[PDB]
Coordinates of all heavy atoms in Angstrom, one line a residue:
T1 N -76.6 -64.3 -152.9 CA -77.7 -63.9 -152.0 C -78.9 -63.2 -152.7 O -80.0 -63.4 -152.4 CB -77.2 -63.0 -150.8 OG1 -76.0 -63.6 -150.3 CG2 -78.2 -62.8 -149.7
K2 N -78.6 -62.4 -153.8 CA -79.6 -61.6 -154.5 C -80.0 -62.3 -155.8 O -81.1 -62.9 -155.8 CB -79.0 -60.2 -154.8 CG -80.0 -59.2 -155.4 CD -79.3 -57.8 -155.4 CE -79.9 -56.9 -156.5 NZ -79.2 -55.6 -156.6
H3 N -79.1 -62.6 -156.6 CA -79.4 -63.2 -157.9 C -79.6 -64.7 -157.9 O -80.2 -65.2 -158.9 CB -78.3 -62.9 -158.9 CG -77.9 -61.5 -158.9 ND1 -78.7 -60.3 -158.7 CD2 -76.6 -61.0 -158.9 CE1 -77.9 -59.1 -158.8 NE2 -76.7 -59.5 -158.9
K4 N -78.8 -65.4 -157.0 CA -78.8 -66.9 -156.9 C -78.4 -67.5 -158.2 O -79.1 -68.4 -158.7 CB -80.2 -67.3 -156.6 CG -80.5 -67.3 -155.1 CD -80.7 -65.8 -154.7 CE -81.7 -65.7 -153.6 NZ -82.4 -64.4 -153.6
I5 N -77.1 -67.4 -158.5 CA -76.6 -68.0 -159.7 C -75.8 -69.2 -159.3 O -74.7 -69.1 -158.5 CB -75.6 -66.9 -160.4 CG1 -76.4 -65.6 -160.6 CG2 -75.0 -67.5 -161.6 CD1 -77.7 -65.8 -161.3
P6 N -76.2 -70.4 -159.7 CA -75.6 -71.6 -159.4 C -74.2 -71.7 -160.0 O -74.0 -71.2 -161.2 CB -76.5 -72.7 -159.9 CG -77.4 -72.0 -160.9 CD -77.3 -70.6 -160.6
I7 N -73.3 -72.5 -159.5 CA -72.0 -72.6 -160.1 C -72.1 -73.1 -161.5 O -71.4 -72.8 -162.4 CB -71.1 -73.6 -159.3 CG1 -70.9 -73.1 -157.9 CG2 -69.8 -73.9 -160.0 CD1 -70.2 -71.7 -157.9
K8 N -73.2 -74.0 -161.7 CA -73.3 -74.6 -163.1 C -73.5 -73.4 -164.1 O -73.0 -73.5 -165.2 CB -74.5 -75.5 -163.0 CG -74.9 -76.0 -164.4 CD -74.0 -77.1 -164.9 CE -74.8 -78.4 -165.1 NZ -74.2 -79.1 -166.3
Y9 N -74.2 -72.3 -163.7 CA -74.4 -71.3 -164.7 C -73.1 -70.5 -165.0 O -72.9 -69.9 -166.0 CB -75.4 -70.3 -164.3 CG -76.9 -70.8 -164.4 CD1 -77.1 -72.2 -164.7 CD2 -78.0 -70.0 -164.1 CE1 -78.4 -72.7 -164.7 CE2 -79.3 -70.5 -164.1 CZ -79.5 -71.8 -164.4 OH -80.8 -72.3 -164.4
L10 N -72.1 -70.4 -164.0 CA -70.8 -69.8 -164.2 C -70.0 -70.7 -165.2 O -69.3 -70.2 -166.0 CB -70.1 -69.5 -162.9 CG -70.9 -68.7 -162.0 CD1 -70.4 -68.6 -160.6 CD2 -71.0 -67.3 -162.5
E11 N -70.2 -72.0 -165.1 CA -69.5 -72.9 -166.1 C -70.1 -72.6 -167.4 O -69.4 -72.5 -168.4 CB -69.8 -74.3 -165.7 CG -69.0 -74.8 -164.5 CD -69.4 -76.1 -163.9 OE1 -70.4 -76.7 -164.4 OE2 -69.0 -76.4 -162.8
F12 N -71.5 -72.4 -167.6 CA -72.1 -72.0 -168.8 C -71.5 -70.7 -169.4 O -71.2 -70.6 -170.6 CB -73.6 -71.9 -168.8 CG -74.4 -73.2 -168.5 CD1 -75.6 -73.1 -167.9 CD2 -73.8 -74.5 -168.7 CE1 -76.3 -74.3 -167.5 CE2 -74.5 -75.6 -168.4 CZ -75.8 -75.5 -167.8
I13 N -71.4 -69.6 -168.6 CA -70.9 -68.5 -169.3 C -69.4 -68.6 -169.6 O -68.9 -68.0 -170.5 CB -71.2 -67.2 -168.4 CG1 -71.1 -65.9 -169.2 CG2 -70.2 -67.2 -167.2 CD1 -71.5 -64.6 -168.4
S14 N -68.7 -69.5 -168.8 CA -67.3 -69.7 -169.1 C -67.1 -70.3 -170.5 O -66.3 -69.8 -171.3 CB -66.7 -70.6 -168.1 OG -66.6 -69.9 -166.8
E15 N -68.1 -71.2 -170.8 CA -68.1 -71.8 -172.2 C -68.4 -70.8 -173.2 O -67.9 -70.8 -174.3 CB -69.1 -73.0 -172.2 CG -69.4 -73.6 -173.5 CD -70.7 -74.5 -173.6 OE1 -70.9 -75.3 -172.7 OE2 -71.7 -74.1 -174.3
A16 N -69.3 -69.9 -172.9 CA -69.7 -68.9 -173.9 C -68.5 -67.9 -174.1 O -68.3 -67.4 -175.3 CB -70.8 -68.1 -173.4
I17 N -67.7 -67.6 -173.1 CA -66.6 -66.7 -173.2 C -65.5 -67.4 -174.1 O -65.0 -66.8 -175.1 CB -66.0 -66.4 -171.8 CG1 -66.9 -65.4 -171.1 CG2 -64.6 -65.8 -172.0 CD1 -66.8 -65.5 -169.6
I18 N -65.3 -68.6 -173.9 CA -64.3 -69.3 -174.7 C -64.7 -69.5 -176.1 O -63.9 -69.3 -177.1 CB -64.0 -70.7 -174.0 CG1 -63.1 -70.4 -172.8 CG2 -63.4 -71.6 -175.0 CD1 -63.2 -71.6 -171.8
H19 N -66.0 -69.7 -176.3 CA -66.6 -69.8 -177.7 C -66.4 -68.5 -178.4 O -66.0 -68.6 -179.6 CB -68.1 -70.2 -177.7 CG -68.9 -70.2 -179.1 ND1 -69.2 -71.3 -179.9 CD2 -69.2 -69.0 -179.9 CE1 -69.4 -70.9 -181.1 NE2 -69.5 -69.6 -181.1
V20 N -66.7 -67.4 -177.8 CA -66.6 -66.1 -178.5 C -65.2 -65.7 -178.8 O -64.8 -65.2 -179.9 CB -67.4 -65.0 -177.7 CG1 -67.1 -63.6 -178.2 CG2 -68.9 -65.3 -177.7
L21 N -64.2 -66.0 -177.8 CA -62.8 -65.6 -178.1 C -62.3 -66.5 -179.2 O -61.6 -66.1 -180.0 CB -61.9 -65.8 -176.9 CG -62.3 -65.2 -175.6 CD1 -61.2 -65.2 -174.5 CD2 -62.7 -63.8 -175.8
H22 N -62.8 -67.7 -179.2 CA -62.3 -68.6 -180.2 C -62.7 -68.2 -181.6 O -61.9 -68.1 -182.6 CB -62.7 -70.0 -180.0 CG -62.4 -71.1 -181.1 ND1 -61.2 -71.8 -181.3 CD2 -63.3 -71.5 -182.2 CE1 -61.4 -72.7 -182.3 NE2 -62.6 -72.5 -182.7
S23 N -63.9 -67.5 -181.8 CA -64.3 -67.2 -183.1 C -63.8 -65.8 -183.5 O -63.4 -65.6 -184.6 CB -65.8 -67.3 -183.4 OG -66.6 -66.9 -182.3
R24 N -63.7 -64.9 -182.5 CA -63.2 -63.5 -182.8 C -61.7 -63.3 -182.8 O -61.2 -62.5 -183.6 CB -63.8 -62.5 -181.9 CG -65.4 -62.3 -182.1 CD -66.0 -61.3 -181.1 NE -65.5 -60.0 -181.5 CZ -66.2 -58.8 -181.2 NH1 -67.5 -58.9 -180.9 NH2 -65.6 -57.7 -181.5
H25 N -61.0 -64.2 -182.2 CA -59.5 -64.0 -182.0 C -58.7 -65.3 -182.3 O -57.8 -65.7 -181.4 CB -59.2 -63.5 -180.6 CG -60.0 -62.3 -180.2 ND1 -59.6 -61.1 -180.9 CD2 -61.1 -62.1 -179.4 CE1 -60.5 -60.2 -180.4 NE2 -61.4 -60.7 -179.5
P26 N -58.9 -66.0 -183.4 CA -58.3 -67.3 -183.6 C -56.8 -67.2 -183.5 O -56.1 -68.1 -183.0 CB -58.7 -67.7 -185.0 CG -59.2 -66.5 -185.7 CD -59.7 -65.5 -184.6
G27 N -56.2 -66.1 -184.0 CA -54.8 -66.0 -184.0 C -54.2 -65.8 -182.6 O -53.0 -65.9 -182.5
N28 N -54.9 -65.3 -181.7 CA -54.4 -65.1 -180.3 C -55.1 -66.0 -179.4 O -55.1 -65.9 -178.2 CB -54.7 -63.6 -179.9 CG -53.8 -62.6 -180.6 OD1 -52.6 -63.0 -180.7 ND2 -54.3 -61.6 -181.2
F29 N -55.8 -67.1 -179.9 CA -56.5 -67.9 -179.1 C -56.3 -69.4 -179.5 O -57.3 -70.1 -179.8 CB -58.0 -67.5 -178.9 CG -58.6 -68.0 -177.7 CD1 -58.3 -67.5 -176.5 CD2 -59.6 -69.0 -177.8 CE1 -59.0 -67.9 -175.3 CE2 -60.3 -69.4 -176.6 CZ -60.0 -68.9 -175.4
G30 N -55.1 -69.8 -179.7 CA -54.7 -71.2 -180.1 C -55.0 -72.1 -178.9 O -55.4 -71.6 -177.8

């Protein structure tokens, strides 16, 4: 209602979260 964030953008930040855990925590993120 306030920000108007489409679901497509939550998929984009989900990809960014997985990209950053994959590069900072490879041993705990097989």
